[PDB]
């Protein structure tokens, strides 16, 4: 019910960076630099610009000091300077608020368009960016937990099919989703760059930002992040994992930054770049869909997510999801999940797997 | 208190094998051979003899068909044939029932002594064993989840200090333990071979066998076992993990065989062979002690363990623990755990970590 | 010198499969299925169709029994059925011999175009292919050395700049190359799918096929392949490696099949999908350009490669390279290489690194 | 022949540390600390004391500034303080020069005996050592190339059987060796701590120290060391590897410190603690004995080794080997090696494997 514009979609390459507003810049720096090992492209008393090991654009993450922690912008790189004009035309036809800045909104980005999209998310589209030293062979800097690439964003929105259509019109291709037999959709994953996703929609009250994900080379790198957090005695900031995903098949970990922005560490999903890439739909009650090993999904993973800002820097209104809740139908008092479809053995009723109930 | 014999202790080398009684031999074979990749030394309609990748003695695990699933014997290899006589003399002085078989109790073992030890456990001591092809460079057989060694046993016993003193007199050296500030001991780890342990005591109703542990070379091998279990749609048989242990520092996984016998997969603990190896005591309320990443300990891990048999093949009666319960004091309704000692932030009152309560 | 056609280039997605002629089908099957663990999509007495772990198209490799071992076709998948028509028009404009088969040249491929390209290589373009079960989460089938994707081809051609221009016009983007200060180009790498390459040009006598490359998830998987070849006592079929590439930054291994077709195993190169991806040029004398650790490049790696066929099944005549030889200028009697530019310490003159000369 | 003393051998636990004389302390610090990540236990202007990640004794390596780079002492820890007395009596009965210091030769060591042993090597025996923080869970300090333990020494000596008998009398157990069909022994490996070795003898002119070896947890940690040396543009200091050993089965790498002291990085050998541990003899012409993958052994690996000092700090005179040279018989002009015994295919005559000759 979001209409398809007559205007052509901008050619989107990939997710490129997020700008997160943080309340204590020093504490945030400790987390992203000292704990996680991201590389400083620029910093001052107001902002920190960070990039992953293999990145050549200026940054994958901007930490901006502000009064209220929130997503300020989720930025996608487009293929040509002309695609920025295409983005402006497209969103204007959709009736969305847009703001164009020839000199960019943040350092290291040139001509850029920010929009309040039809789902209420602050999207940025840009082509021009300052190239920096690509650190991909700087093994003298490589940490045991090295984050090598920015992989994806994940957005919380109340109406998944509505957002899905809009993103498909924008050119994203759906790779996987979670539905039930009653026809409710709980989540969808969609890509531009030929991995499982560049962004994803998670059913819930929104707009809110669920997480930003970075890649590692190997599974042991993700294990090391966990181990380091234990050594630093901040294991309470490990939210969920590590595990193997069902959807995406990636090895994963979720952690919480000082403002409770959720960061995923992710590795080893599969190639999706063929236009007839087979879509995979999982049943919501399948206990292997989110954690392949059947480990329970922590309730905060379903309930907590970051505020997002509008173009004035104010927090966007949040709309209540009315479709069924994934938490409620799977691990809530009236929920259930299964290990084998139709088998009562290895099924869980009114609680989570592995012997746990909701706290 | 268990008295220290005048008779010298047998010189114990290491844990060597366990004999488990199973109810359906074919189903057990599916689990240990097809799922886990253990190597068959001998089998018939009654027994299956299995060994790990780097083993040169006949077997590390004997599966015996029987009416009641239980541990039949935990076996330790001794240094010399004369140590079998030393074990006989030792246990006779302790007033324990012993049985001696010059040609062994199981195939591929020679002169062997089985005892009902002071804690009610069926111990075996042997030297003589049939050597087999050591498969350590048979990379043509190497599985993505290859189990390379037998590492340890873990025993459930009601009175940990009582058992600890007995095992110390036997020559085992304590490497780590869990205590509280009120004089209660919850668990102890003890070795002969220079790893963290060859056996361990876990406080609880006993005698019961908590688990048998096998090692892999690398952490990814353990991940693969989990992954394979999800592919076989038996993720319900993954009990706990994978994780990083606090005590022992090993990467770990617990899975359940078809008779609910618990198997741990384990890797990368540290060297303990020096006689003044520093002992490490963890506080029971430290939420990083069992899983370093603070993931909750599944309640079945505290409550479930295997029956053990006497020398007549009858199940040993269960003596109740009267000391405080680790489950109750950490994750029960009146329990408590912390992330940082003295910090209310990251502490848990009357529930488990990560947002869960007992199911 | 190879002119740019007026007709538009077909939109090429990625390298998709190679068809290799082999002399003994059973022996080839032993190598690719038994040693390397590729998955059989179809086989009969004349052909074996194989795919990698994550593939959903019918196959990545066709082994065809024939009198003379050679490359029969290197196939690229195109975006739409119409791009096959575009491919036909494009190559007909170039004056190349083309053959079109509405029902394909091999099983599981539909409408297909094969061409004898300007460099004398048998290229195939197709869209239509039979989808098969994507094995990406079949961890019950996963090998310790599992080959997960087809990554690239590598072609030997006498004139690298000539081939480079042609491939760029065809839409490949150069990511890395090797040159010297005189202005000779020794090698170039070029992509469509957003990895370091889908094909590459190696300077030498040609047309010949240097290798076909498959990916693994992790570096340990490549180590396992070497270990397994040791156990099978076929270590003489390990040609070069394992190592870390300078160009591409990938961890690698080269092995030889029963007909001396070279196969590379490859993992963890970087993202190239942005249109302004920085192009890296290495100096031919840089001893870290091919193996980052400075290990010598085996002479057979520069001199040996597979014959290629024309459309009638006859071997293509070889044209000699007149440009300087990478072998000669680096490891030959009058060659040299350096560890640090301008430093004689760590330089090698008239021999290879690590204390070796040419055999 | 070296006679077996009447006096009992000291009970040796393990190799514990090496004291190396270096010419430029700062440069040596840059290598061991900044490149390799060893942990500083103590330093001043004359010496640097270093330990591995899991070590609790004071140090595994002492770097001592001096005029001539050499091994000053190879130290073994003994079981009790009385074993130092036993070591003194033992070497005194052997007619060896001994020096006893009640307060040690280096910091963090107590009562210590140094000897000029029968093969000319400076051995130390000690029990007393200052315990330090065991860093085994300090994942906040863990390097991507972390060295976790000291594993072994390797000694060059002209007569391997003579040295072997002496070490066996001292209580070391031979695990593997290399011989030919004409009765020549080229190398032997022997242990106390239950790994493949604590020291080893390599046939050649001696006494010289071949190398000191440290362990990592995993194979990727060794790969990272290579990658970091490439990044630092010191790949010319990678002498040999990385590879899989035949003898020992360990994954390995050899690198050279600023004074050309050879250091091995080593992981994942097997358990040898049983007293009937199967001994393994390899033929010297077996091309998988040293590198399992058949990669050629660098000639410098056979010819170069460190000087060793006597108790006055003077360099020990070299005695020439008269037995056949492993280099000459395998890779020399008249050498030979095989891949499969009895198979001419995959054999090498008068040159090294993989297409190389001696430089
Ligand atoms: O990156 C992702 C891929 C898969 C999943 S899921 O927990 O497996 O659904 C979570 C995620 O959405 O964050
Ligand atoms: O895949 C490749 C990537 C890099 C290299 S090179 O040996 O580093 O040039 C070789 C290769 O051309 O086969
Ligand atoms: Ca208390
Ligand atoms: Cl535990
Ligand atoms: Cl070797
Ligand atoms: Fe995600
Ligand atoms: Fe255990
Ligand atoms: Fe390649
Ligand atoms: Fe060594």
Tab-separated table of N, CA and C and ligand atoms in Angstrom, chain A residues 151-154 189 197 199-200 202 210-214 240 245 248 250 252-254 262-266 290 301, ligand 6:
chain	number	residue	atom	x	y	z
A	151	UNK	N	28.166	-5.171	7.592
A	151	UNK	CA	27.349	-6.102	6.810
A	151	UNK	C	25.932	-5.645	6.538
A	152	UNK	N	25.218	-5.226	7.582
A	152	UNK	CA	23.789	-4.898	7.422
A	152	UNK	C	23.218	-4.092	8.582
A	153	UNK	N	22.010	-3.572	8.349
A	153	UNK	CA	21.177	-2.955	9.375
A	153	UNK	C	19.966	-3.893	9.597
A	154	UNK	N	19.306	-3.732	10.734
A	154	UNK	CA	18.048	-4.440	10.968
A	154	UNK	C	17.093	-3.463	11.636
A	189	UNK	N	14.328	-10.533	5.290
A	189	UNK	CA	15.725	-10.131	5.023
A	189	UNK	C	15.839	-9.779	3.542
A	197	UNK	N	21.723	-10.115	3.307
A	197	UNK	CA	21.031	-8.837	3.436
A	197	UNK	C	21.889	-7.609	3.567
A	199	UNK	N	19.628	-4.790	4.529
A	199	UNK	CA	18.786	-4.422	5.636
A	199	UNK	C	17.757	-5.516	5.864
A	200	UNK	N	17.058	-5.409	6.980
A	200	UNK	CA	16.073	-6.439	7.325
A	200	UNK	C	14.986	-5.762	8.120
A	202	UNK	N	12.211	-6.517	11.174
A	202	UNK	CA	11.824	-7.341	12.317
A	202	UNK	C	10.500	-6.765	12.803
A	210	UNK	N	16.914	-2.026	15.197
A	210	UNK	CA	17.206	-3.228	15.931
A	210	UNK	C	18.701	-3.396	16.175
A	211	UNK	N	19.481	-3.351	15.106
A	211	UNK	CA	20.952	-3.460	15.263
A	211	UNK	C	21.709	-3.038	14.012
A	212	UNK	N	23.022	-2.837	14.168
A	212	UNK	CA	23.969	-2.679	13.047
A	212	UNK	C	24.882	-3.901	13.170
A	213	UNK	N	25.227	-4.526	12.042
A	213	UNK	CA	26.038	-5.745	12.061
A	213	UNK	C	27.363	-5.522	11.343
A	214	UNK	N	28.440	-5.996	11.963
A	214	UNK	CA	29.766	-6.103	11.346
A	214	UNK	C	30.180	-7.549	11.182
A	240	UNK	N	22.904	-11.900	23.491
A	240	UNK	CA	22.433	-13.129	22.895
A	240	UNK	C	23.555	-13.749	22.068
A	245	UNK	N	22.932	-18.901	13.146
A	245	UNK	CA	21.578	-18.557	12.709
A	245	UNK	C	20.988	-19.669	11.842
A	248	UNK	N	19.824	-17.142	7.232
A	248	UNK	CA	21.159	-16.607	6.855
A	248	UNK	C	22.321	-17.584	7.017
A	250	UNK	N	24.490	-17.673	9.197
A	250	UNK	CA	25.672	-16.979	9.716
A	250	UNK	C	25.956	-17.344	11.163
A	252	UNK	N	27.018	-15.867	14.716
A	252	UNK	CA	26.601	-14.549	15.201
A	252	UNK	C	26.827	-14.329	16.695
A	253	UNK	N	26.771	-13.062	17.078
A	253	UNK	CA	26.799	-12.612	18.473
A	253	UNK	C	26.095	-11.252	18.515
A	254	UNK	N	25.293	-11.019	19.557
A	254	UNK	CA	24.742	-9.680	19.807
A	254	UNK	C	25.247	-9.117	21.124
A	262	UNK	N	22.343	-1.962	19.951
A	262	UNK	CA	22.714	-3.350	19.767
A	262	UNK	C	23.606	-3.493	18.537
A	263	UNK	N	24.713	-4.218	18.713
A	263	UNK	CA	25.649	-4.486	17.620
A	263	UNK	C	25.680	-6.006	17.412
A	264	UNK	N	25.519	-6.452	16.169
A	264	UNK	CA	25.725	-7.874	15.843
A	264	UNK	C	27.093	-8.069	15.233
A	265	UNK	N	27.746	-9.162	15.616
A	265	UNK	CA	28.962	-9.611	14.928
A	265	UNK	C	28.529	-10.880	14.166
A	266	UNK	N	28.952	-11.009	12.910
A	266	UNK	CA	28.283	-11.912	11.957
A	266	UNK	C	29.346	-12.479	11.013
A	290	UNK	N	16.042	-19.222	14.299
A	290	UNK	CA	16.812	-18.069	14.762
A	290	UNK	C	18.139	-18.508	15.337
A	301	UNK	N	15.776	-9.337	23.143
A	301	UNK	CA	16.033	-9.307	21.692
A	301	UNK	C	14.738	-8.970	20.931
E	6	LIG	FE1	21.384	-9.222	11.867
